Amino acid sequence: MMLLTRHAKERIAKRLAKKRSLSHIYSSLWAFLERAVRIEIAEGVVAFTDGRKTLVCVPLDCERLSRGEILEKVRGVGVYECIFPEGRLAKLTRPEKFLESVPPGEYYFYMNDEKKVLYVGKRRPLLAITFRPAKRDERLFYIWA
């Protein structure tokens, strides 16, 4: 349910056993999110914590669209990092090709030409600015969730 900044990718990748590939980094993120809880922690800031680490995120401007509408949006778009959480897909490829793996349906859609990134998913995407050890109040929230 998120895209990773360069910084968050590096912090996640530092703890990996396998090689530091895009797919392995996102797989580690997805495993973390399975055990983490969400905190609406400040204006424009969402934290996800498992009581040991915390992913700090900011909202992204996205739009709910049908797959067909998304296909129109991505006409002629070049190679992007494309993320589809429900398919466990994080791939450097062209969006039109990527969308062959996305079944018809309504999805939150985000694309950014400066960062060359695309997200399609059922949950609204956030952008993770860092991944770091959890602070005391985040740990307390986790314990009492």
mmCIF file of C-alpha atoms in Angstrom:
data_model
loop_
_atom_site.group_PDB
_atom_site.id
_atom_site.type_symbol
_atom_site.label_atom_id
_atom_site.label_comp_id
_atom_site.label_asym_id
_atom_site.label_seq_id
_atom_site.Cartn_x
_atom_site.Cartn_y
_atom_site.Cartn_z
ATOM 1 C CA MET A 1 0.000 0.000 0.000
ATOM 2 C CA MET A 2 2.993 2.232 -0.468
ATOM 3 C CA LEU A 3 5.784 3.324 -2.691
ATOM 4 C CA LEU A 4 9.284 3.552 -1.231
ATOM 5 C CA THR A 5 11.579 6.554 -1.493
ATOM 6 C CA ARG A 6 15.241 5.999 -2.259
ATOM 7 C CA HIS A 7 15.977 6.418 1.433
ATOM 8 C CA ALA A 8 13.364 3.922 2.631
ATOM 9 C CA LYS A 9 14.579 1.424 0.015
ATOM 10 C CA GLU A 10 18.147 1.700 1.281
ATOM 11 C CA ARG A 11 17.141 1.221 4.907
ATOM 12 C CA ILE A 12 14.979 -1.796 4.042
ATOM 13 C CA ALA A 13 17.667 -3.246 1.779
ATOM 14 C CA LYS A 14 20.332 -2.995 4.506
ATOM 15 C CA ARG A 15 18.600 -5.781 6.464
ATOM 16 C CA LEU A 16 18.122 -8.160 3.518
ATOM 17 C CA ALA A 17 19.676 -11.619 3.309
ATOM 18 C CA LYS A 18 19.264 -12.124 -0.454
ATOM 19 C CA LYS A 19 20.500 -9.599 -3.004
ATOM 20 C CA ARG A 20 19.128 -6.051 -2.907
ATOM 21 C CA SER A 21 16.756 -6.270 -5.850
ATOM 22 C CA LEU A 22 13.619 -4.205 -6.351
ATOM 23 C CA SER A 23 11.475 -7.325 -5.882
ATOM 24 C CA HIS A 24 13.283 -8.382 -2.710
ATOM 25 C CA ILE A 25 13.009 -4.890 -1.215
ATOM 26 C CA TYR A 26 9.272 -4.695 -1.850
ATOM 27 C CA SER A 27 8.821 -8.270 -0.592
ATOM 28 C CA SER A 28 10.472 -7.253 2.678
ATOM 29 C CA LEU A 29 8.174 -4.226 2.862
ATOM 30 C CA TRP A 30 5.098 -6.382 2.324
ATOM 31 C CA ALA A 31 6.181 -8.819 5.032
ATOM 32 C CA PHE A 32 6.692 -5.904 7.431
ATOM 33 C CA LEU A 33 3.251 -4.494 6.661
ATOM 34 C CA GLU A 34 1.636 -7.824 7.545
ATOM 35 C CA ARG A 35 2.820 -7.408 11.129
ATOM 36 C CA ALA A 36 2.664 -3.606 11.426
ATOM 37 C CA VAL A 37 -0.122 -1.336 12.673
ATOM 38 C CA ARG A 38 -1.045 2.050 11.223
ATOM 39 C CA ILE A 39 -0.855 5.323 13.177
ATOM 40 C CA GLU A 40 -2.338 8.599 11.911
ATOM 41 C CA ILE A 41 0.495 10.324 13.668
ATOM 42 C CA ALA A 42 0.467 13.930 12.411
ATOM 43 C CA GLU A 43 -0.931 16.061 9.615
ATOM 44 C CA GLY A 44 0.365 14.484 6.423
ATOM 45 C CA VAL A 45 2.258 11.733 8.279
ATOM 46 C CA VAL A 46 1.274 8.079 8.661
ATOM 47 C CA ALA A 47 3.443 5.638 10.600
ATOM 48 C CA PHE A 48 3.402 1.860 10.349
ATOM 49 C CA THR A 49 5.094 0.081 13.225
ATOM 50 C CA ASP A 50 5.617 -3.496 14.335
ATOM 51 C CA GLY A 51 6.953 -2.319 17.680
ATOM 52 C CA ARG A 52 10.555 -2.754 16.513
ATOM 53 C CA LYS A 53 10.752 -0.750 13.279
ATOM 54 C CA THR A 54 8.650 2.075 11.878
ATOM 55 C CA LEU A 55 7.926 3.072 8.296
ATOM 56 C CA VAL A 56 7.175 6.820 8.128
ATOM 57 C CA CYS A 57 4.943 7.778 5.211
ATOM 58 C CA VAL A 58 3.282 10.784 3.594
ATOM 59 C CA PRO A 59 0.105 10.825 1.462
ATOM 60 C CA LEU A 60 0.134 10.872 -2.322
ATOM 61 C CA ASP A 61 -2.328 12.507 -4.709
ATOM 62 C CA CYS A 62 -4.101 9.523 -6.272
ATOM 63 C CA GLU A 63 -7.330 8.757 -8.116
ATOM 64 C CA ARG A 64 -9.661 5.757 -8.113
ATOM 65 C CA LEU A 65 -9.978 4.540 -11.705
ATOM 66 C CA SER A 66 -11.034 1.488 -13.654
ATOM 67 C CA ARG A 67 -8.337 -0.596 -15.307
ATOM 68 C CA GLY A 68 -9.472 0.768 -18.674
ATOM 69 C CA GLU A 69 -9.177 4.349 -17.460
ATOM 70 C CA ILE A 70 -5.685 3.574 -16.146
ATOM 71 C CA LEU A 71 -4.763 2.100 -19.526
ATOM 72 C CA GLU A 72 -5.703 5.420 -21.131
ATOM 73 C CA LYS A 73 -3.628 7.345 -18.566
ATOM 74 C CA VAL A 74 -0.489 5.281 -19.274
ATOM 75 C CA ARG A 75 -0.618 5.478 -23.094
ATOM 76 C CA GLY A 76 2.917 5.856 -24.428
ATOM 77 C CA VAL A 77 4.482 6.044 -20.958
ATOM 78 C CA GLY A 78 8.012 4.660 -20.920
ATOM 79 C CA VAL A 79 9.845 2.422 -18.484
ATOM 80 C CA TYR A 80 8.742 2.970 -14.875
ATOM 81 C CA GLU A 81 9.051 1.207 -11.556
ATOM 82 C CA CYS A 82 5.576 -0.364 -11.427
ATOM 83 C CA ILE A 83 4.065 -1.576 -8.145
ATOM 84 C CA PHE A 84 0.941 -3.759 -7.774
ATOM 85 C CA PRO A 85 0.752 -4.963 -4.150
ATOM 86 C CA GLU A 86 -2.039 -7.497 -4.667
ATOM 87 C CA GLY A 87 0.060 -9.245 -7.318
ATOM 88 C CA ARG A 88 3.285 -8.963 -5.313
ATOM 89 C CA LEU A 89 4.685 -7.184 -8.371
ATOM 90 C CA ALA A 90 7.450 -4.588 -8.250
ATOM 91 C CA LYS A 91 8.923 -4.414 -11.744
ATOM 92 C CA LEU A 92 10.884 -2.004 -13.920
ATOM 93 C CA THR A 93 8.816 -2.170 -17.120
ATOM 94 C CA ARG A 94 6.376 -0.230 -19.319
ATOM 95 C CA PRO A 95 2.994 0.434 -17.653
ATOM 96 C CA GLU A 96 0.939 -0.876 -20.583
ATOM 97 C CA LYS A 97 2.707 -4.243 -20.338
ATOM 98 C CA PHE A 98 2.533 -4.203 -16.530
ATOM 99 C CA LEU A 99 -1.238 -3.793 -16.712
ATOM 100 C CA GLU A 100 -1.597 -7.213 -18.368
ATOM 101 C CA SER A 101 -1.073 -8.578 -14.835
ATOM 102 C CA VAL A 102 -3.848 -6.421 -13.342
ATOM 103 C CA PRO A 103 -7.391 -7.876 -13.622
ATOM 104 C CA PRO A 104 -10.296 -5.595 -14.553
ATOM 105 C CA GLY A 105 -11.498 -3.634 -11.551
ATOM 106 C CA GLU A 106 -11.323 -0.302 -9.770
ATOM 107 C CA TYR A 107 -7.959 0.696 -8.304
ATOM 108 C CA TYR A 108 -6.239 3.651 -6.745
ATOM 109 C CA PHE A 109 -3.748 4.892 -9.320
ATOM 110 C CA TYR A 110 -0.661 7.056 -8.941
ATOM 111 C CA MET A 111 2.006 7.881 -11.493
ATOM 112 C CA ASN A 112 4.912 10.324 -11.393
ATOM 113 C CA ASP A 113 6.980 11.142 -14.463
ATOM 114 C CA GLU A 114 9.834 12.803 -12.578
ATOM 115 C CA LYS A 115 10.393 9.784 -10.320
ATOM 116 C CA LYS A 116 9.372 7.254 -13.035
ATOM 117 C CA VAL A 117 7.066 5.340 -10.685
ATOM 118 C CA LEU A 118 3.565 3.896 -10.940
ATOM 119 C CA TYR A 119 1.247 2.354 -8.362
ATOM 120 C CA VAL A 120 -1.986 0.427 -8.886
ATOM 121 C CA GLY A 121 -3.748 -1.114 -5.912
ATOM 122 C CA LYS A 122 -6.935 -1.444 -3.918
ATOM 123 C CA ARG A 123 -5.546 0.673 -1.066
ATOM 124 C CA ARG A 124 -4.678 4.342 -1.422
ATOM 125 C CA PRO A 125 -0.880 4.584 -1.784
ATOM 126 C CA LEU A 126 1.433 6.404 0.594
ATOM 127 C CA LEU A 127 5.111 7.283 0.101
ATOM 128 C CA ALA A 128 7.545 5.946 2.703
ATOM 129 C CA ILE A 129 10.198 8.556 3.494
ATOM 130 C CA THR A 130 12.145 6.349 5.910
ATOM 131 C CA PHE A 131 12.313 3.025 7.737
ATOM 132 C CA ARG A 132 13.960 3.199 11.145
ATOM 133 C CA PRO A 133 13.877 1.800 14.691
ATOM 134 C CA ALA A 134 10.569 2.491 16.402
ATOM 135 C CA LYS A 135 10.404 5.319 18.925
ATOM 136 C CA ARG A 136 9.030 4.776 22.416
ATOM 137 C CA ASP A 137 5.562 6.167 21.656
ATOM 138 C CA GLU A 138 5.284 4.053 18.492
ATOM 139 C CA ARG A 139 6.241 0.962 20.499
ATOM 140 C CA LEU A 140 3.603 1.841 23.109
ATOM 141 C CA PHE A 141 0.967 2.220 20.390
ATOM 142 C CA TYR A 142 1.921 -1.192 18.990
ATOM 143 C CA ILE A 143 1.657 -2.837 22.422
ATOM 144 C CA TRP A 144 -1.819 -1.437 23.043
ATOM 145 C CA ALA A 145 -3.215 -1.978 19.525
#
